[PDB]
């Protein structure tokens, strides 16, 4: 089939989309870990 070759193409493609949002949320999390350590070092 040509449809089953494109459904897997779209499934694999969005498995990449879910992967890179988790990567981009980790960068944001590490900045929150940094902003807490810097603000804690003040008090």
């Amino acid at each position: 089939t040509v449809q089953a070759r494109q459904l897997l193409s779209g499934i694999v493609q969005q498995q990449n989309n879910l992967l890179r949002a988790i990567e981009a949320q980790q960068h944001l999390l590490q900045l929150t870990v940094w902003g807490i350590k810097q603000l804690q070092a003040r008090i």
Binding site: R20, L28, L31
Partner: protein
């Protein structure tokens, strides 16, 4: 690092997540 750059990195990645979540919405196959 600097708080100046922290404002520039927090806002840069939030836009990248929103674009990446926006594409995941335009690429979610709700069959």
């Amino acid at each position: 690092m600097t708080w100046e750059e922290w404002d520039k990195k927090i806002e840069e990645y939030t836009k990248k997540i929103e674009e990446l979540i926006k594409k995941s919405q335009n690429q979610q196959i709700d069959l």
